[model samples]
Target chain A: XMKXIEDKLXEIXSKXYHXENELARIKXLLX
Target chain B: XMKXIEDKLXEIXSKXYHXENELARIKXLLX
Candidate 1:
């Protein structure tokens, strides 16, 4: 039900890039 | 645009808990 690229994007967004509003927005747009 | 839920749910719900729906029922429902 999930893909590794999606998981990687999630991991990066959640663990690494979270709280960065621009990155969050980009991720929101991407995912 | 946070997407993680592993932090556990808050009692009164916080900024991160938006749309969780366990609390804050709208007044329209009590009508």
Candidate 2:
């Protein structure tokens, strides 16, 4: 499947943001 | 400028690798 880089990068960024948020939540839970 | 996500991700990865290496070198120097 051929897709543009912006779309892919956006997806990665979105996923990374979500993961970061999740990690923060987990850290908060531990704290 | 239009670029593919792979290219961008590769670039970012490359930079990250370089930065990591530099950081390691710095730590070695400090040690």
Candidate 3:
């Protein structure tokens, strides 16, 4: 139960980080 | 030629905007 929460948090954090990277790549594509 | 450039610019700009929206969504999911 507690372990699952930690894993979920890490998964979401990774996704958030990847989103920022994609945003930067899109900006580079734009400019 | 110039028209294609304008179209490409619009395409890229739209994609950039969408990327921002997705990033925001990911942040909301994280928090």
Candidate 4:
């Protein structure tokens, strides 16, 4: 695959982005 | 009578629940 490293990096970032969103939701609930 | 102005995050870090393995190793290189 071309640009494999960058591809995987972006894929990893996608999950983390959603994970961060979930954390925001959780914090709001905790508050 | 207590505080968590900065707590629980330590577990998140050591557990690596919020960071990917490669991302962690890569950044630790710079840290």
Best by DockQ: 2
Query: Per-residue lDDT tens digits of candidate 4, residues A3-25?
Result: 55545545655666676666556
For candidate 2, lDDT tens digit of each residue in B1-31? 3456567678667655655664565555555
Off by over 4 Å in 2: A1-3, B2-31
The superposed Cα distance between candidate 4 and the true structure at residue B8, in angstroms, equals 26
* DockQ, structure candidate 3: 0.05
Greater DockQ among 3 and 4 belongs to: 3
Q: Pick the candidate with the highest lDDT.
A: 3
RMSD of 2: 7.5
Q: How close is candidate 1 to the true structure, as a TM-score?
A: 0.22
Please give the TM-score for the first chain of candidate 4.
0.62
Off by over 4 Å in 4: B1-31
lDDT per residue (tens digit) for residues B1-31 in model 4: 0122123334445435544654454455546
Q: Interface RMSD (C-alpha) of each candidate?
A: 14.0, 8.4, 18.6, 18.0
The digit string of per-residue lDDT tens for model 3 on A1-31 reads: 4564455457556655766786676566555
Candidate 3 residue runs with Cα over 4 Å from true position: A1-31
Worst 10 residues of 2 chain A by lDDT: A22-31
Give one digit per residue, the lDDT tens place, for model 3 in B1-31: 6556555656655665676676667546553
* Error in Å for residue B17 of model 3: 1.2
Residue runs of model 1 more than 4 Å from their true location after superposition: A17-31, B1-31
Predicted complex 4: DockQ: 0.04
TM-score of each: 0.22, 0.45, 0.47, 0.43
